[PDB]
Write a structure and sequence with these properties.
The structure is cut from a larger assembly and holds two copies of chain A and one copy of chain C. Chain A is of the alpha+beta class. Helices cover 35% and strands 16% of the residues of chain A. The termini of chain A are far apart. In chain C, strands 1-2 form a two-stranded antiparallel sheet. The chains are: A alpha+beta, C mainly alpha. The B-C interface holds B 13-15, 17-19, 21-22, 25-26 and C 19, 21-22, 25-26, 29-31, 33. Chain A: Belongs to the HEM-1/HEM-2 family. Chain A: This is Nck-associated protein 1. Chain A: It is found in: Cell membrane; Cell projection, Lamellipodium membrane.
């Protein structure tokens, strides 16, 4: 049931929370230039910005 | 019991071995709690 | 060329799986693990028309044989 976007009882599941976090904190920050896609490490790495 | 087991297990994560790598380059452990004196 | 290609690929593979938190902790403590510099071996890997004295040499086949031997040796060493 954790795989579905909503469990039987009708509460948020881990998959939905992870999707929301990834779409609203990780990918959103990339558009601001604070994070970039590093193909060498096959992962997103924070830039060496002052913030 | 699950909380205790998770607390025991988290000690095995790689992040706890940084000090050992640093000591060798710049030159308590699990299992002890299971010994029954 | 085959030896250095295999070494670079193995080093990159090993670095990829290394925990990032451990690397950050080591860097903070003063024991940074240097990353492997990038390389452009793919161009040589995709070469099948090396011409020398009228001979066409399939460099890819030789590199494949060498990497296969190296992988077998590494697996045997691990076992």
């Amino acid at each position: 049931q954790q795989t579905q976007h909503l469990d039987s009882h009708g509460e948020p599941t881990i998959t939905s929370l992870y999707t929301n976090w990834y779409l609203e904190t990780l990918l959103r920050q990339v558009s601001n230039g604070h994070i970039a896609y590093f193909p060498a490490m096959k992962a997103f790495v924070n830039l060496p910005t002052e913030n | 019991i699950c909380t205790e087991q998770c607390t025991l297990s988290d000690q095995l994560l790689p992040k706890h071995c940084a000090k050992t790598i640093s000591q060798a380059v710049n030159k308590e452990k699990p299992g002890v709690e299971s010994m029954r004196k | 060329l085959a030896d250095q290609i295999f070494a670079y690929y193995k080093v990159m593979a090993g670095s990829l799986l290394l925990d990032k938190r451990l690397r950050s902790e080591c860097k903070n403590q003063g024991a940074t693990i240097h990353l492997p510099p990038s390389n452009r071996y793919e161009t040589l890997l995709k070469q099948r028309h090396v011409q020398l004295l009228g001979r066409s040499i399939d460099l890819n086949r030789l590199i494949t044989q060498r990497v296969s031997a190296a992988m077998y040796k590494s697996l045997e060493l691990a076992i």
